[PDB]
Amino acid sequence: NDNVAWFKQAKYGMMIHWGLYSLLAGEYRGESSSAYAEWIQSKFQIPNAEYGNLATAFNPLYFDAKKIVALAKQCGMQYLVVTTKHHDGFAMYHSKVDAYNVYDATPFHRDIIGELAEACQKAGLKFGLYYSQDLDWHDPNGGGYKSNDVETAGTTWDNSWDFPDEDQKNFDLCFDNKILPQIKEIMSNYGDIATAWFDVPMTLSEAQSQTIYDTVRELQPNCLINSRLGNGKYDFVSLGDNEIPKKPSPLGLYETAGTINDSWGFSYHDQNWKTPRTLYRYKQHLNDFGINYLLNVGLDPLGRVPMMAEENLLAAKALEDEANRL
Amino acid sequence: MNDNVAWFKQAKYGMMIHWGLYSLLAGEYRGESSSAYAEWIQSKFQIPNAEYGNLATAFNPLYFDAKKIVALAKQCGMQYLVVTTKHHDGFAMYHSKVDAYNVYDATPFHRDIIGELAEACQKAGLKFGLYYSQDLDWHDPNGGGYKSNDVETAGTTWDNSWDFPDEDQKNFDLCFDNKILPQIKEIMSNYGDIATAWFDVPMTLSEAQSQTIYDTVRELQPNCLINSRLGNGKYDFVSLGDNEIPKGFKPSPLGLYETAGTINDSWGFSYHDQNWKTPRTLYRYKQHLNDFGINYLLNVGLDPLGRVPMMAEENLLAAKALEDEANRL
Amino acid sequence: NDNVAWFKQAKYGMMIHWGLYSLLAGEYRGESSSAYAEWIQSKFQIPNAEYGNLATAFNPLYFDAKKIVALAKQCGMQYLVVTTKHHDGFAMYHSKVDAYNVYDATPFHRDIIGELAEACQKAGLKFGLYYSQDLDWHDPNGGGYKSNDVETAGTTWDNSWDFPDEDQKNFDLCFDNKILPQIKEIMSNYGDIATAWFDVPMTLSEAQSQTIYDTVRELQPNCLINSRLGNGKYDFVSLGDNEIPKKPSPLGLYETAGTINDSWGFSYHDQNWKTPRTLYRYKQHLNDFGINYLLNVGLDPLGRVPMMAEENLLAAKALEDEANRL
Amino acid sequence: MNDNVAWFKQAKYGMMIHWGLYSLLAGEYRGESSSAYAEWIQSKFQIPNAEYGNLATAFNPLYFDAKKIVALAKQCGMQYLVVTTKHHDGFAMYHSKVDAYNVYDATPFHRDIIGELAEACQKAGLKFGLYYSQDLDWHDPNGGGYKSNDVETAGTTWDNSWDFPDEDQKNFDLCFDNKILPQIKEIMSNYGDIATAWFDVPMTLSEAQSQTIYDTVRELQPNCLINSRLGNGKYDFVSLGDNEIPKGFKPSPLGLYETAGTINDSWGFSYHDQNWKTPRTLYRYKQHLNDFGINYLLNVGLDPLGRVPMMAEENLLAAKALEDEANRL
């Protein structure tokens, strides 16, 4: 597509983390999440019955996709990527296949992904999706259960507390019944999807990885795919910073994702916001190396960009504009 | 007797709880900061009652647990707990017969917070006090404040001057008769023995109205000790305000004194306010007040899920450990 | 002078707090100063022999008046006011009358006020002076000793610890021997002085107040004088914020002084920096009411503008420029 | 015996001290932040030795008091104290015969910090350990690091590649023979019994040179327990690095283990780093390490006046109170 040229020149995007984890805001029964507040269910092994109950309290009165996209646009971000479903397995769109979602399970009773997809269409911002194709703590057969020999931002990679029978788990059950169906949903509704963001597989076959690639290719012909999916199945390489000089990308497309503070999900204890000058300088450094900066905002329980995140994005923009006048 | 006088003389330490619709905004409104006082946020931004009240539809504090809150208070050596029955925004945190603008009728939560705390205290053996905003009520067309705006606040005007912008056609008596006295009767009649009563310094309240509340409390709660703030003849202990603390003055004839503070700089929960007093500051202040025969009433602003903030709990518990250490050495 | 017109249009100035208190940086023997780190000697009643000993450690290797004035200039500040001598009584210039000064008492062995006066001359910034004409904790007969019935940011207003004989103290001794002589020094050397900043007298006669007024008028004909001096003896009223609407100034000249964090002097525990947006908005509000914003920087022990102060001034400038383009 | 082995098994808790020229910059250089590691600041900004060394002329820590530091350590139940004799910047914090780039010869202070701490520990009955950077030395033309820059650091290059930019003409042997071995002999001979010895993992040091230091320490300080970091045959306790802590691995044949941490995120003092671990975090970590037979070596980065930062002292003391409370309950 002309989508390859467009990504080469896009430079700057907004990432959005939002889900049930946002209501706990980095805190559980007087104890801190790790740096990663969105991992809180794994960190404290919160039973699905309890964690899911957060859905009943999810009523973000101040959520406004128009205002979020406007902010992104004012900062010169040319695209927006959003959590359709994180490791906890809660869909932030109206999933036909699973009622564990913002639309069916919450007083809010609205499709977040829908409102953001629309807001982007009208503002002329491309629209990307993140989806956790491997881990699903809500699914009896969610991924992670053949790869716990490594430490996480929680405890185990899988829901080992609600489903403590690793040897009687089968990821295929989860892949066939939830993963592929939900990927079809998000890739079919919500119009043109410019970017697709999957996790590095731990517990899914080359087949399953190839399957998602094909499903995305068929459904969203122009959709650029994050390297994390698999060694043959991508269009741009997501760089982790220590991979940047002073994973072959044949299209020459590169993205580095970061957050303004230290968490992806909202965390009221994390006030360690990168200063405007840090945000601007990092953006400048990545852009000069032909790397897109995908900068994460973790929306708060009322659906708001935290005050200091908004302030710092806007001040970073002012510094950039000032510097482009010289 | 009122052996309640002797008990207050020796109580030394209490928990205060601020909680209401303001807690959901958590010191933030449309990208902008509340003042140090997050509970004033409606006045600060002149949030129309229609919008602010809509917060009630989002109030579902899944983790609220009066037992756990009272247990914490008890573990820190606090002998009583005082709670916001209704703050300046005029939203009742109990099941008010007289006004449906309350936690029970207006919220998914559909529960009486004052009730659960009153019970939790009974069972734990902690006295139970009440705070009520008898003068300001931003929800009431004729709420107080509208004859006293010549002075600055933690918001804008003292009264709801935005929804009700006709200062010259306002009458507080309407509000006093229809909401204030009735609600004070409610909280002073239900929820059992009330050990402490906390009113604001009147701005827009006659001597009559002040005397009326005094009498109502005296009749309903014979042993209830009353905060000086109410009125110059109408109290049992003087609440001291920081600059009134030892190294005009209102006579305390019973010798009873209380200073209220917060752990951070806000009474209501505020995400942006992480300026928690260290355990050593909490302990030292408590010790200083207690040595001058002053009770320390220390405020916790519960978060939107009904939780004591992690750093508030940590700091209370560490302050307790320092105190115990010091009482062994 | 054309100095009246110039102040009406100046809008923005840098204030500098710096002295021995800066080395303690808000901390003494494991205990915190108040919000006002420069009050630390009074707060802990540090004996003059000990506090003065800080002079032996005062070697600010990174002090650079050119760089400080450049920053001020880049932020659009049109003048710079500096502590010649704060309540602790230590002169930050080469005082003939008292060797308790940066030049004579410190390894640094340099005139701070001199270097700043020069840097301002060359950059085309006006140059103002602050001087504590009443309190002097180093002087046996320093002020404050007839007015302790009120609380301070320390303990007593006077040095009541080294000199504990209030009834045998005589401020005239201090006024004649240190105050008037030092005011003559700072008002005679260091060239044109655009602004003069005295404290509200507690313990000095109408005579003594009139005397300083006259001395300034004679020495610095065009020097605009801060209302704090006395009810007949000023050119602009210094406003304290809660005095601003929604002290008659007949020239129509107004100044409000603030700090970026909560302290005037450097305080390593005070990281409560006003955000760029707060600084810019406050400046805008004061300027719209015809009030000059005098914004304080408390230099650190090495003579540096703290990193977050510099960042926040520069970002506030970028926001202002952005807003002036619209 | 070496009853020093039994003593380390039961010691549980030690104070580490970082202090040097880097402490005066306090995590800041020309308007810019050090990394999390303020002590790396010279490498981070490639500060020429002429300039960085000039900091020595400003080093006059009027409030340094080894007695008070050791007293604090003792009150927190720390049984030993380890100190930076010389960090990567190559500045000795003792009176080195072999190199005048030291606190005694180069600074107004004109005093041996290692000496005063060694004495203070003797009198208080605390063991005394030493840290020394045997490989990196940014002051030495032939300092280590110059054959291992393919990996990222808390600064820029591992070696001083800015003052000495001729990697291909550098020879570490020059540095080892003339500065490293001589200085290790100095610190291991003066300052009395040395209980603990802390070297960096070699990058640019032969087996010979590693064995040499081992032997030198063994000869000079028979009872000195040596940190695993030195070399795979040349140690007595394994220093565990966080991700090595229980819920390849190097065998500890004596069963001796140490984990070093800091209270905030820096080893050296940093004005901008106020991210102090809470007392409850300190206590819990100590408890967890101790239960797995691991000693907690907890670092304090002294400020330019030689002071334990106020929040470091507060947090150590509050952590102690929590520990004592928990050991009564």
Numbering used by the authors:
A (entry chain C), C (entry chain C): 2 to 247, 266 to 345
B (entry chain A), D (entry chain A): 1 to 247, 264 to 345
Kindly provide excerpts from the paper associated with this entry:
To gain insight into the structure-function relationship of AlfC, we solved the 2.5 Å resolution X-ray crystal structure of full-length wild-type AlfC. However, unlike this enzyme and most other α-fucosidases, AlfC is missing the C-terminal domain often hypothesized to be a carbohydrate-binding module. AlfC crystallized as a tetramer, with opposing active sites separated by ~37 Å. To confirm this, we performed sedimentation equilibrium analysis, which also indicates that AlfC exists as a tetramer in solution. In AlfC, the nucleophile (D200) is conserved in both sequence and structure. However, no general acid/base residue is present within the expected ~5.5 Å distance. Structure and sequence homology implicate three main candidates for the general acid/base residue: E39, E274, and D242. The D242 Oγ atom is ~19 Å away but located on a loop with very high B-factors that extends into a disordered region in our crystal structures, which together suggest a high degree of flexibility. It is common for α-fucosidases to be crystallized in either an open conformation, as seen in these structures of AlfC, where the presumed general acid/base is far from the active site, or in a closed conformation, where it moves into the active site to support catalysis.
